[PDB]
Design a protein around this ligand. Sequence first.
Ligand code: NA
Ligand code: NA
Lengths: 301, 301
Amino acid sequence: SGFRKMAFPSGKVEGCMVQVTCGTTTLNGLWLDDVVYCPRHVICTSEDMLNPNYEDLLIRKSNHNFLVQAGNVQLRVIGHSMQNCVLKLKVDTANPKTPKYKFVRIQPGQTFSVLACYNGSPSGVYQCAMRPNFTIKGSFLNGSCGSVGFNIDYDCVSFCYMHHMELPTGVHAGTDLEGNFYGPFVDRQTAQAAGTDTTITVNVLAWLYAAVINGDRWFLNRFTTTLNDFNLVAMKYNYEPLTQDHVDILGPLSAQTGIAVLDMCASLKELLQNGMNGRTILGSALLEDEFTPFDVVRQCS
Amino acid sequence: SGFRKMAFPSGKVEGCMVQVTCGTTTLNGLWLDDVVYCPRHVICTSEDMLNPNYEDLLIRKSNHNFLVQAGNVQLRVIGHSMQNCVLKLKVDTANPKTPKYKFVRIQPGQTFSVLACYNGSPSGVYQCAMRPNFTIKGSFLNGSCGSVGFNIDYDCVSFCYMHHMELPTGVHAGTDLEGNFYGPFVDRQTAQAAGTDTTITVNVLAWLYAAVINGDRWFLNRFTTTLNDFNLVAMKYNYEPLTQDHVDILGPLSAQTGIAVLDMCASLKELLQNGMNGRTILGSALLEDEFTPFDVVRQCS
Ligand code: NA
Ligand code: NA
């Protein structure tokens, strides 16, 4: 027992990180087979960050202007191309450490591990969720461009995120591995609205089930509710509406604990209306929404 | 910016995990050079967990009774020995993936990454702190025996923890890599007192400095205090007394933010006396004590 925000073991990804330099800009890339993936930011300079003309910038660059190093091993670049907001650098050697892998576009509310990296070198790993508004609340310093997010399922790494930017509000924005931003963002250094976020209701419910499984049970009550009545409360407190698809996804946890989903919703309702009363759940004094139902079942069995 | 509970990249440790089976018991071991390290629990059965006679149990075992597998690679055991609560299995092959490493006994209040593992296979990574009372609040299921905790400093892995047991209270106890328990614990399935814990004051202070560095600044106030006056409050709220050694360790963060340590202590005092008033700091509604000053400076630069 115990309940922690747990990342995937990062070894399979650490073997794929490289440094890519173009001119004076250095950032991180991902070396899979004989292709290196990195943010197209690598071809900009300060003085054109307000609205870079990436097509013009890239035309000035040849293969030999991209310097790629994997540890101290230098790679030879034999092709380049831009797709959306990513660059694909063809190199002459396949990465011997390439894991079984896939590129996935995750949904808002889904979680993934981030391997924060600087100069091609891994520095730490943590879990986060793709917010409803398609931002992430990461931890990323100057040089973190190109860091990647992923899930692992039996030795297959599903890459889902490549880090680009910090918005002026402190939250983070990035792309899938095909270079398409999650959310409305563009790769320029400008104030950009993220728009209203919400709390991920089905994850909060998953986490309450995890709490019960660990014997934090104080918030269970003698009430039930309906989907409609709970959704009234969800809207009041800026939670996502609960659908029968969410109820279905919560069925294993329901069955395991013997607590019907709508009974757990009645507990959540009471927590939203009354607060926590200066108590804690699984070591938190807030309602936590960055564990999916799949995460809870992983860590709870 | 942003502030997350970040683990070390686990790749260097994942290459060292193996499965060790003795009779019907399977748990995790750590393969470094030509030695496999694992909890001596591996030689017990149910029916002798209340007070195992490990010396007698081990006498019944020969080299060939320890089955060690690294992936599907089986290792040949050519010696065994017990030291404290660990077994050292000499094998005939040095681990080709052995990192540069050291064994360290960490101090209470220090943090480390845990690689949770089952059947020799890594499942996830998370950060925690060694509590003042020498427990850890981990996440560990049946089969987690032998999982390890570590820090990494420039490609040198400092192993500091090997997981043994869950106490009946849900918190976790384990040893250094020489098999000595942290705390008063013994490897038997018995209720055992951990004794009073405290909050790690110097870490809470570090975390407030991290909050300021990220622009969560609402708790700063117009007051100061003395070490003596703050220690009166620390004792009231079951915080560790603050020493000048702790003040000295906080000096870089002090210098970076321009906030004197005793002025930050006055903020903390006010937080302890008044609570958080339904607000948050770095995404938490509690005072967080699992980031050391060294952790904050790592993640904040
Ligand atoms: Na959650
Ligand atoms: Na802390």
